[PDB]
Amino acid sequence: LGSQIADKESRHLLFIGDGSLQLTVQELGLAIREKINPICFIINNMWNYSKLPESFGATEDRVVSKIVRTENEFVSVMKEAQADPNRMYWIELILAK
Amino acid sequence: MYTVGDYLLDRLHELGIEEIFGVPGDYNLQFLDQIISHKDMKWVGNANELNASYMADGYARTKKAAAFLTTFGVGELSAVNGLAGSYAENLPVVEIVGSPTSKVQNEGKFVHHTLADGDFKHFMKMHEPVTAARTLLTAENATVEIDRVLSALLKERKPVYINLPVDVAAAKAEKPSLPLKSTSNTSDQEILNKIQESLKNAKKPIVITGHEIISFGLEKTVTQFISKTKLPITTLNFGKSSVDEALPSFLGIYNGTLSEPNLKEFVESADFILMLGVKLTDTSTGAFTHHLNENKMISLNIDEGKIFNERIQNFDFESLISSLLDLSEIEYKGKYIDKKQEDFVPSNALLSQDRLWQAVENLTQSNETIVAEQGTSFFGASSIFLKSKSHFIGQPLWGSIGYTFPAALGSQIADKESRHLLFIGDGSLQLTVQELGLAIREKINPICFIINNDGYTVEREIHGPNQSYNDIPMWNYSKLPESFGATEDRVVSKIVRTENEFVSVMKEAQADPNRMYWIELILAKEGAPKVLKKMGKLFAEQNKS
Amino acid sequence: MYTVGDYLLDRLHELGIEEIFGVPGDYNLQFLDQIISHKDMKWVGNANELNASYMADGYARTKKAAAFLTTFGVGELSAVNGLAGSYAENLPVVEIVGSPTSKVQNEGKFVHHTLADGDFKHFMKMHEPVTAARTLLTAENATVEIDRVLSALLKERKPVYINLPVDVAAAKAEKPSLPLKSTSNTSDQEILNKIQESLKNAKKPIVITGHEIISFGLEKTVTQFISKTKLPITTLNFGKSSVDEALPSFLGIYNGTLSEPNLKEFVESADFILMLGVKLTDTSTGAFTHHLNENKMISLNIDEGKIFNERIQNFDFESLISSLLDLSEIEYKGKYIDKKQEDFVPSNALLSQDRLWQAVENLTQSNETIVAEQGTSFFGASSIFLKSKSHFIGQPLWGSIGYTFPAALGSQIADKESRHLLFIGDGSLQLTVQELGLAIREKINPICFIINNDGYTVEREIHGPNQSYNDIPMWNYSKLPESFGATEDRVVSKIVRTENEFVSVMKEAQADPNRMYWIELILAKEGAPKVLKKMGKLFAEQ
Numbered sequence A: 001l002g003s004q005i006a007d008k009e010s011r012h013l014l015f016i017g018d019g020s021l022q023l024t025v026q027e028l029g030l031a032i033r034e035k036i037n038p039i040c041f042i043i044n045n046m047w048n049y050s051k052l053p054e055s056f057g058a059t060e061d062r063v064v065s066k067i068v069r070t071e072n073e074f075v076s077v078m079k080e081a082q083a084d085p086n087r088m089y090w091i092e093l094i095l096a097k
Numbered sequence B: 001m002y003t004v005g006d007y008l009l010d011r012l013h014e015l016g017i018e019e020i021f022g023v024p025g026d027y028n029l030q031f032l033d034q035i036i037s038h039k040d041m042k043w044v045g046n047a048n049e050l051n052a053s054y055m056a057d058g059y060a061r062t063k064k065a066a067a068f069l070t071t072f073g074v075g076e077l078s079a080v081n082g083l084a085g086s087y088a089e090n091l092p093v094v095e096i097v098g099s100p101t102s103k104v105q106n107e108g109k110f111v112h113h114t115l116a117d118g119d120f121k122h123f124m125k126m127h128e129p130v131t132a133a134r135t136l137l138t139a140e141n142a143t144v145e146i147d148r149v150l151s152a153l154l155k156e157r158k159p160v161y162i163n164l165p166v167d168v169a170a171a172k173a174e175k176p177s178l179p180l181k182s183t184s185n186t187s188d189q190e191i192l193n194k195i196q197e198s199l200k201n202a203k204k205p206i207v208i209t210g211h212e213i214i215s216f217g218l219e220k221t222v223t224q225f226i227s228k229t230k231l232p233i234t235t236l237n238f239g240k241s242s243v244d245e246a247l248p249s250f251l252g253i254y255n256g257t258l259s260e261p262n263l264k265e266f267v268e269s270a271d272f273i274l275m276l277g278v279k280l281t282d283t284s285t286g287a288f289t290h291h292l293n294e295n296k297m298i299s300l301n302i303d304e305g306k307i308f309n310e311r312i313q314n315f316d317f318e319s320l321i322s323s324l325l326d327l328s329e330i331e332y333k334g335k336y337i338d339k340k341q342e343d344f345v346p347s348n349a350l351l352s353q354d355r356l357w358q359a360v361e362n363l364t365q366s367n368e369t370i371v372a373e374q375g376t377s378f379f380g381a382s383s384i385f386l387k388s389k390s391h392f393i394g395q396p397l398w399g400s401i402g403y404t405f406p407a408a409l410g411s412q413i414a415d416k417e418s419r420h421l422l423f424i425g426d427g428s429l430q431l432t433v434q435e436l437g438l439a440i441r442e443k444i445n446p447i448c449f450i451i452n453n454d455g456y457t458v459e460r461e462i463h464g465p466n467q468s469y470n471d472i473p474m475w476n477y478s479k480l481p482e483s484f485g486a487t488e489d490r491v492v493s494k495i496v497r498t499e500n501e502f503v504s505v506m507k508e509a510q511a512d513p514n515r516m517y518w519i520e521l522i523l524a525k526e527g528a529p530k531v532l533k534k535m536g537k538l539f540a541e542q543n544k545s
Numbered sequence C: 001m002y003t004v005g006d007y008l009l010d011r012l013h014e015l016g017i018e019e020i021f022g023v024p025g026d027y028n029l030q031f032l033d034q035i036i037s038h039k040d041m042k043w044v045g046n047a048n049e050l051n052a053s054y055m056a057d058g059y060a061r062t063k064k065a066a067a068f069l070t071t072f073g074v075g076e077l078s079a080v081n082g083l084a085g086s087y088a089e090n091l092p093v094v095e096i097v098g099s100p101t102s103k104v105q106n107e108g109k110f111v112h113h114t115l116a117d118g119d120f121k122h123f124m125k126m127h128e129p130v131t132a133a134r135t136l137l138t139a140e141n142a143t144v145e146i147d148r149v150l151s152a153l154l155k156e157r158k159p160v161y162i163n164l165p166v167d168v169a170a171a172k173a174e175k176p177s178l179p180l181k182s183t184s185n186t187s188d189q190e191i192l193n194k195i196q197e198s199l200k201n202a203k204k205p206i207v208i209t210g211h212e213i214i215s216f217g218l219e220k221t222v223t224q225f226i227s228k229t230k231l232p233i234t235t236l237n238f239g240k241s242s243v244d245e246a247l248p249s250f251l252g253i254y255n256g257t258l259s260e261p262n263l264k265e266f267v268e269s270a271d272f273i274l275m276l277g278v279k280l281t282d283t284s285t286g287a288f289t290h291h292l293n294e295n296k297m298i299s300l301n302i303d304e305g306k307i308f309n310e311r312i313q314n315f316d317f318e319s320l321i322s323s324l325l326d327l328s329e330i331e332y333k334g335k336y337i338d339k340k341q342e343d344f345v346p347s348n349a350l351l352s353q354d355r356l357w358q359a360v361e362n363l364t365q366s367n368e369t370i371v372a373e374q375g376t377s378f379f380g381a382s383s384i385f386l387k388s389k390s391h392f393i394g395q396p397l398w399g400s401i402g403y404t405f406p407a408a409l410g411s412q413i414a415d416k417e418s419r420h421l422l423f424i425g426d427g428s429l430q431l432t433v434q435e436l437g438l439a440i441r442e443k444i445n446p447i448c449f450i451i452n453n454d455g456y457t458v459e460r461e462i463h464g465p466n467q468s469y470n471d472i473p474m475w476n477y478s479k480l481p482e483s484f485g486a487t488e489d490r491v492v493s494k495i496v497r498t499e500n501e502f503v504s505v506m507k508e509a510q511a512d513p514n515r516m517y518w519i520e521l522i523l524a525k526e527g528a529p530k531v532l533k534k535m536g537k538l539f540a541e542q
């Protein structure tokens, strides 16, 4: 988030595990307030993080929430996210095996 | 000791100028020494002054300020045409003119580079209609005058002229403490609200940006404005790249009835038009076949602007544009046009005009500057959609052929990180070819395409297709670098006839950032881009006896 | 139909103009057709407008009138420097500028080649200080205006400017019946007598002629004047060849204290000076070290004159000179100085500057024109004695480098019977090289010497000998014709390093009148003519 604020011109892509995100998740508040637009991928594997932005008061005009399970879904959401520089993306990846 | 020369150069540094172009003469030597000694400034000497002025122009386009040095009389009058073109298209170029010692000027002697009438004031007078400010420096007025004219450059971004007598350059002065350069008593605030109110209300708005945006280096501002709002945007070819064409709300180039139908219909059916830094010229409006209803339009320019046919006098162009970012609750929720872009599949077919530009569009990459000379090149190239973070240089208002060669080189020097692609016709290259020397010396690496169609095709399309005045001597263009002293480790020379060859050489060139490419394209004389088939008939119609 | 365009061209024919130079543009295309149609006029299109203007200048020098065509804005402003130089050295050049239709100009449209301010009058205004007359033609005023400005050209032999809108060129007009264009007479008669009386009395007179003689094509008059009288004569370098240098009473070039001592002493000890068409400039008077006492001098110029420090305003320059033939009983019985004609003996020694010009002087032939660019070339070449019926082109007042290349070509076209020898430096050739194309197309046969001394030597001699701004990118000059599409049956390329090589190539070139010669001379960067060793120190002083 800090880095993203440091350079608005560089689109940040975050890859964090659900376990770790829990430790600092509260900064989701700041993300919403500061209207910054990173692409956050939260890899699964204990709470239901998908609907976290909504809890922190974000609307679909601010944060877009996704769940990805397949390859097609992944490709689609990646392109969709990169295509939209004006919103933050909150993407839950479910990895196989 | 610190001198007037030093002062001028430090001031030029503050404008962001890192290279000065031009040609030595006896009356500008010595100041030339001062340029050398300044470590933050590099001398890039041209073959001729006209080329220098064109090169400074191109430099200004990219660096956002430029300067070149000539010698009194022969130098300045050689460059006047390029300076004229810098005035016409509004580029911030300083011309420095080294002149004889004030002792000689006052004694009114018949010295070289004069009319032997002892008058030293003719040439500055001749520069009146093509400069925003001019000055003949004295030891006394120097600092004031330098600051006056450089301020005017900042204000208007039009070229300015400084006559620097030998002895005046060597005269004492103190380092500048205060920097160079209100709100129009915030009369800009009313305008912003009217723009904002109009934009909130519009069911289908169009932003049209133009050359003046480039003049002030506001491209990134505009791009960021369009990005957040998602407002539909088009540019004229006079100001191509005043926005990032890769944005999803960029429609293409609006050029009167020569526009692609969908864009034409979008623009001309809009309920609100916001024109920023635009001038409607014959070549940029499809021979004045534009339909931009003034009653639903707010236009802003450097000098003036209009709110729904009501002229405003009093505002600050630069910050007014900048303020567009602080508008709010602007978001376009409508559709655009079908930006369906296809893929080029080459064959062994000989290279045609339309196919060339199709290939160029498909093969162009990001972080590139595209320079196109008047003629087939401009007509074809200007219609291309650029990749992200790309730039375009064309001169469709002033329209001086030969320009793009030096200009390309200047621009390339201005930003080493942006790969320049030059498209110049055989006819035009002949005007300014000598700068090939500089290209080799400066070890810059542009990709030059020379369109050899055995003459002035655009002229052949306007009038006299078969007349001898449209033929030019046929040089062997590919063998030019060798003549000018280039080796294969500096310049790569090709001749291209087919589509496959073209694709291959394009990729090969873009793949090698460390060498300049000199590519001779063989197109037919009869061959012209679709756009020009029409526009040539329209030029003839303008010039009907 | 007969048109305004036709009128202009017929008028131009009467001035003796047989070729028109320039560069096409949309606003001059239709008139360009008219040039083609006229069988008595040939279009010779250049690469750029500046080159065109230089080429028209050179043409004027020889043909005694010239014209070139440009397009509004971009064309005319490119050429302005060359036109300026035509004003400065007083050459009769017509610039025709094709402009948009009067309909477009009146509606004040933002059309190409304008500042998008709807003003069509800027560029003509910019031409004010470097033209003797200008006009923006209309359908109504055309014939009158063409005649007005072409008359001014005849009067002053300075360049003139005609703005020709597309539609105005196509507008109906009648063929001219009267030819193109006196007052002062009693003061002409007085002057002639004063000249004649002074000449009969002088125990040691000197005639000094200058550029204005060339301007009016009075060279033959002057030569015939000097021949009958046997009067001592010298020219400045500003007007070299205003007399036949082969005459026995021609002393050499007077150039202040840089003059050869004997000439210097002759001129400056004269008891009577007759200066015709002369202007004293820094470069033509050895940095103003001339000593021409005004009290023993009658000077005549186009614009004004002096009889022993008494200004005249009222006279006709041309016929006043012509009248010098109708004097009587003038015959000089005194001595001259000394023409130490010594054959050049070449060795395998590398080519030096002083040796070059010695060789050129010895090897030059009759019926030749010598063109020399500012720099080592001008300094060396201007001091040469030309052979009989020879000519010289140099531009020491305006002093625009690059000039001599196009100018040489124009002059060569002007008189196919005079073999041109061009001496241009590497530095200068870079400005105007593109005209090599035209040279090949027009199948003209000049002998071009390129003095490759690896930069601007003259600048190196004034200031900053080792500075980077005095270096130029080094081209392979000999390989230039090939690049521009010449074959060996059109252009012969040489590289010369030694004296023997030079002599050989000179003779070989002069022996072959059917091909152009492209000769690259290798001189050292430090090497400069004796004249320049001094004159360079004096430029620095200024």
Ligand SMILES: Cc1ncc(C[n+]2csc(CCOP(=O)(O)OP(=O)(O)O)c2C)c(N)n1
Residues within 6 Å of the ligand: B023, B024, B025, B026, B071, B074, B075, B078, C373, C374, C375, C376, C377, C399, C400, C401, C402, C424, C425, C426, C427, C428, C429, C451, C453, C455, C456, C457, C458, C459
């Ligand atoms: C149009 C123009 N630009 C610049 C100058 C300044 N200038 C005068 S002589 C000269 C050097 C030319 O050198 P070159 O042609 O190599 O001759 P060299 O003295 O080396 O034989 C220069 C740059 C000028 N006189 N005219």
Ligand SMILES: Cc1ncc(C[n+]2csc(CCOP(=O)(O)OP(=O)(O)O)c2C)c(N)n1
Residues within 6 Å of the ligand: B373, B374, B375, B376, B377, B399, B400, B401, B402, B424, B425, B426, B427, B428, B429, B451, B453, B455, B456, B457, B458, B459, C023, C024, C025, C026, C071, C074, C075, C078
């Ligand atoms: C300085 C200048 N001189 C003349 C013109 C007139 N003019 C405009 S385009 C053109 C022909 C360009 O021919 P070329 O570069 O060969 O283009 P192409 O054949 O690719 O159309 C001419 C002569 C001009 N615009 N600018």
Ligand SMILES: [Mg+2]
Residues within 6 Å of the ligand: B375, B425, B426, B427, B428, B451, B452, B453, B454, B455, B456, B457
């Ligand atoms: Mg072409």
Ligand SMILES: [Mg+2]
Residues within 6 Å of the ligand: C375, C425, C426, C427, C428, C451, C452, C453, C454, C455, C456, C457
């Ligand atoms: Mg040289």
